[PDB]
Description:
Elements: E1 7-10, E2 17-25, E3 31-35, E4 41-45, E5 49-52, E6 59-63, E7 71-81, E8 84-91, E9 94-98, E10 103-106, H1 108-111
Antiparallel strand pairs: 1-2, 1-5, 2-3, 2-10, 3-4, 6-7, 6-10, 7-8, 8-9
Amino acid sequence: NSFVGLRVVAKWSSNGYFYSGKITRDVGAGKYKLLFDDGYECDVLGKDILLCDPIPLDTEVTALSEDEYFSAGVVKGHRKESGELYYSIEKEGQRKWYKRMAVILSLEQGNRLREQYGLGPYE
């Protein structure tokens, strides 16, 4: 048994930022059989939709504000319940508990991690 019910990030093309996903089963070497945190399922190769925390417990990440123009706040405490999801983003001096889609992350906040926790098992 392992991470076949894992916590994931969602990038289709590398365009500099990722959305959120959750896994259902593991598909081969490099792949994940996944559904988005909001209900969109597929099987894909992982360097797109992969095994995350999502991101490090010290992370000034981006919070859902505009498309190229979004603003940062910090991941500190997070959990996932059997049909409820909450990520505590420390923002504006207070904690915003959002299901993972109200946070985003960019590639280099992903790439720092990519080798150690998730953001690429395959090349």
